[PDB]
Design a protein around this ligand. Sequence first.
Ligand SMILES: [Zn+2]
Length: 246
Amino acid sequence: HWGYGKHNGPEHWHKDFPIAKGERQSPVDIDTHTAKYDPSLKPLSVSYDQATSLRILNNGHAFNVEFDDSQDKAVLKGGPLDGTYRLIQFHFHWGSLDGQGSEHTVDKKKYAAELHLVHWNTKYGDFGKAVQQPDGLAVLGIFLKVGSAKPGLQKVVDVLDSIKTKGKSADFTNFDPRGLLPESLDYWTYPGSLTTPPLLECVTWIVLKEPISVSSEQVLKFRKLMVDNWRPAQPLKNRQIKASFK
Ligand SMILES: [Zn+2]
C-alpha cells in the first residue's frame, strides 16, 4: 500500500522495504562543492535515434512511457558505465506547486519536476534480472524548471487526459525522447537506488547539470493525474558524487 501520503509515504517505506535505510539510497542532495571532479569520467553517449516508444501507462504513482527494449534501439553508454544499457521507460516526479517536485536537489534547491530515463544493462537477461544486480540499471535524471515550453514534451502532455485513471494505458508510438534532452551532457554520477519501492540498490545515477525548461501549462497537466510523487533526499552515507566537469 505504499504511496506518497502521510500514512503510506516515504517515511513509512522502510517497514515493508527495510533497504530504505540502506547504504546506497536515492535520491540525494548534490552538493556542488563536495562533488568531486573525476577526469577519468568519459562523455555520456545517449543514442536515442532508433527509439521505439510503445505506450504510456498510469501506474498509480506516475506515468511511464514504455519502449521496445527487445533489441538495441535507444541506448545509453559511456560516462561512468561499462557496456550498453537499453532504455525501457521514462517517467517524471513532480510537485503540487512549482517550488518542489524534484527528487535530487542541487545545493538544496528543488526543481519543479525531474525526468528519469531508466535503462538496463544488457549483460543481464532482461530488466527483471538487471534490478537484482548492483550495476543493473542506469538512470539519466534531468531537472525541469518552469519557464518556456519544451516542444518535445507536448505530445506527452496532450495524451495524459486519456490515462487519468490509475491502471489505464494508451498507445504511444513514435515518440522521440531526444526532444527531452538539454544541450549539455555535463553530469554528476553516484551509485544509488530506485527511488520507489522496492528501492533496490541497482542504479548508477547520471544526473544532468543543465535542466530543461517546461511551461507552467505543461506541468499543470501532470498535476491533473496526481501530485507530490517525489521521495526526499536521502543521506549520502559512504558514497562520493563525482562530476564530469570542473
Ligand atoms: Zn523516478
